[PDB]
Amino acid sequence: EGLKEFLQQTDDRFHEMHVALAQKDQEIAFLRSMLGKLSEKIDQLEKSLELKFDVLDENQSKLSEDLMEFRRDASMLNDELSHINARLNMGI
Amino acid sequence: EGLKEFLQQTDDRFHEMHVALAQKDQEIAFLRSMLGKLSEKIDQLEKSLELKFDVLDENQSKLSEDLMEFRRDASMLNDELSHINARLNMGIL
Amino acid sequence: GLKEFLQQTDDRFHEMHVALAQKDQEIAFLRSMLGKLSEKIDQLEKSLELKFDVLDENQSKLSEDLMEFRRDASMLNDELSHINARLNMGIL
């Protein structure tokens, strides 16, 4: 007869599973939070990139407009040069 | 024979464990798909960033090349004025 | 004697331990993928720091060149007026 010790052996086994499950709840919770930290880090990095990009886009536009404007001044200077070279051959 | 209710108590606990495990299957399934979306999102940002820098680098190169030609045109032009100024002191006055 | 059922529960506990053992694997991989992705982000942040400081200097260095070159353009335009003014002193 007897065999009543086995009743506790399964009761003990269920405690092992509850403890092992309790870690599983724990491990998943971090992975969730760790994932959230990365998605937050990425989204904020995206925001700083948009600003830092809009700045360099504006600077590229201001400098490139200046470059094209200076091409006009080269033509205006060249126009005045054609007049002068013709004028010097009009007399010593 | 003195506690047959325990026969059912274990059947209840096994059901608790199966559902609790079923949750773990779901949480990992969600975590897996969410992870894949992030790894894809990261991959797309890497590619789009490569372009926008390669784009602006071309503008920086073409704009700086424009400067180098314009300094040359300015240097030859400044030479052209110095030669002219030298001729003016040789002219009758 | 209900000894057939006592083993039936022992079998189910083995099923769960295997299912738990898989969960350890799935969590371990997901952990590493997070570390790899979080690693991918950090190098991307650093690479942006370098690539931005370069282009920011190039925009500043080129724009400083513009400011010097616009000065040189004004001196050139003055000397053309200088030459034309001397030619108008030959008439007079």
Written in H, E and C, the secondary structure of chain B is CCCCHHHHHHHHHHHHHHHHHHHHHHHHHHHHHHHHHHHHHHHHHHHHHHHHHHHHHHHHHHHHHHHHHHHHHHHHHHHHHHHHHHHHCCCCC
Supply angle C-alpha B13, C6, C10, rounded to 5.
65
Kindly provide the resolution of this structure in angstroms, with one decimal: 3.3
Q: What are phi and psi of B35, to 5 degrees?
A: -60, -45
Distance CA B70, CA A53 (A): 28
DSSP-derived 3-state class of residue A91: coil
Structure tokens at A20: 């092992």
Contact (Cβ atoms closer than 8 angstroms) between residue C31 and residue B32 = no
Supply angle C-alpha A41, A43, A49, rounded to 5.
100
Helices C3-91, A5-88: inter-axial angle, 10-degree rounding: 10
Q: Which residues contact C44 (CB under 8 A, 6 or more apart)?
A: A45, B42, B45, B46, B49
Distance CA C60, CA C54 (A): 10
Contact (Cβ atoms closer than 8 angstroms) between residue B67 and residue C69 = yes
DSSP labels for C15-82? HHHHHHHHHHHHHHHHHHHHHHHHHHHHHHHHHHHHHHHHHHHHHHHHHHHHHHHHHHHHHHHHHHHH
Contact (Cβ atoms closer than 8 angstroms) between residue B42 and residue C37 = yes
Looking at CA atoms only, how far is residue B39 from chain C in angstroms?
7
DSSP-derived 3-state class of residue C11: helix
Breaks after residues in chain B, judged by C–N over 2.5 Å: none
Q: What is the CA radius of gyration of chain B?
A: 40
Cα distance between the two ends of chain C:
139
Interface membership of C40 toward A (CB under 8 Å): no
Interface membership of C66 toward B (CB under 8 Å): yes
Sign of CA dihedral A70, A76, A81, A82: positive
Contact (Cβ atoms closer than 8 angstroms) between residue B54 and residue C55 = no
H or E stretch at C92: none
Name the structure determination technique. X-ray
Q: Which of B81, B10, B91, B90 is nearest to A78 (CA)?
A: B81
Distance CA C30, CA B35 (A): 8
Written in H, E and C, the secondary structure of A8-64 is HHHHHHHHHHHHHHHHHHHHHHHHHHHHHHHHHHHHHHHHHHHHHHHHHHHHHHHHH
Q: Which residues contact B35 (CB under 8 A, 6 or more apart)?
A: A35, C30, C33, C34, C37
Are C84 and A83 a contacting pair at CB < 8 A?
A: yes
Structure tokens at C12: 């189910």
Distance CA C74, CA C16 (A): 86
Buried b / exposed e along B64-86 (16+ C-beta atoms within 10 A): eebbeebeeebeebeeebeebee
Q: Which of A87, B74, A59, A45 is nearest to C88 (CA)?
A: A87
Which of B38, B39, B71 shows the shortest C-beta gap to C69?
B71
Which of A45, A59, A73 shows the shortest C-beta gap to C45?
A45
Residue C9 Cα to chain centre, angstroms: 56
Beta-carbon pairs below 8 A across chains A and B: 57
Interface membership of B42 toward C (CB under 8 Å): yes
Interface membership of B93 toward A (CB under 8 Å): no
A3: left (phi over 0), alpha (psi -120 to 50) or beta: left
How many alpha carbons lie under 13 Å from residue B93 in its C-beta half-sphere?
Answer: 9
Interface membership of C6 toward A (CB under 8 Å): yes
Residues of C in contact with B60 (CB under 8 A): 55, 58-59, 62
Q: Which of C41, C47, B43, B24 is nearest to A35 (CA)?
A: C41
Contact (Cβ atoms closer than 8 angstroms) between residue A17 and residue C16 = yes
